[PDB]
Amino acid sequence: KVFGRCELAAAMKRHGLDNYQGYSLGNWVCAAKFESNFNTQATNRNTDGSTDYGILQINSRWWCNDGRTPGSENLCNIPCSALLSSDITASVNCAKKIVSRGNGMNAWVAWRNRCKGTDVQAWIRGCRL
Ligand SMILES: [Cl-]
Ligand SMILES: [Cl-]
Ligand SMILES: [Cl-]
Ligand SMILES: [Cl-]
Ligand code: NA
């Protein structure tokens, strides 16, 4: 599913990401824009042999099981394919664990490099939330 911007904002708010670990909703929408272009089906292979999955490009080494990432932890206890669903619940639950870990949203390199320090509230402008 390719979410609309306000559609994704509403879903992330409903699932409790607005202000989660102090990160306002626009941070999460901006992260999703640059990680996945709002596409739940996005996948991208990393140089270490892991793969990133879903709207927030969650990685198979630490977080989800894809059956092909040797030495993988599955700290979210899900199959990585759960992260490609039109239902963002599994991505949100796993993102909450990731962002709680100690480096916060710096875990998402697209967030560091294209959202951090910017006017992220622009990403929820116009939305009825
Ligand atoms: Cl929308
Ligand atoms: Cl957009
Ligand atoms: Cl915001
Ligand atoms: Cl959803
Ligand atoms: Na894994």
Author numbering: 1 to 129
Copy text from the publication.
Here we address this question from biophysical, structural, and immunological perspectives using structurally related lysozyme proteins. To understand the conformational basis for selection or counterselection of cross-reactivity against foreign and self-antigens during antibody hypermutation in germinal centers, we used a mouse model where the cross-reacting foreign and self-antigens are well-defined lysozyme proteins. To investigate the impact of conformational flexibility of foreign antigen on antibodies that cross-react with self, we analyzed mice to track and sequence HyHEL10 (Hy10)-derived antibodies on single B cells responding to four structurally similar lysozyme proteins. The results show germinal centers have remarkable ability to select antibody producing cells along novel hypermutation trajectories, transmuting an antibody with no capacity to differentiate foreign from self into highly foreign-specific antibody derivatives, exploiting conformational flexibility in antigen and antibody.
“Self” lysozyme protein (mHEL3X) was expressed on the surface of all mouse cells under control of the ubiquitin gene promoter. Superposition of the structures revealed the backbone of the self and foreign antigens to be extremely similar (rmsd of 0.29 Å for 94 Cα atoms) with differences primarily restricted to surface side chains. In response to self-lysozyme-SRBC a very different antibody VH-domain mutation, S52R, was carried by 60% of Hy10 GC cells, including 30% where S52R was paired with Y53F. Bio-layer interferometry revealed that the S52R mutation, alone or in combination with the Y53F mutation, abolished measurable binding to the highest concentration of self-lysozyme tested, representing at least 100-fold lower affinity. Thus, when foreign SRBCs displayed a protein structurally identical to self, the Hy10 trajectory adopted was mutation away from self-recognition. Following HEL3X self-lysozyme-SRBC without self-reactivity, few Hy10 GC cells followed the affinity-lowering S52R mutation trajectory. Instead almost all had acquired VH mutations Y53D (84% of cells), Y58F (10%), or both, that increase affinity for HEL3X (self-lysozyme).
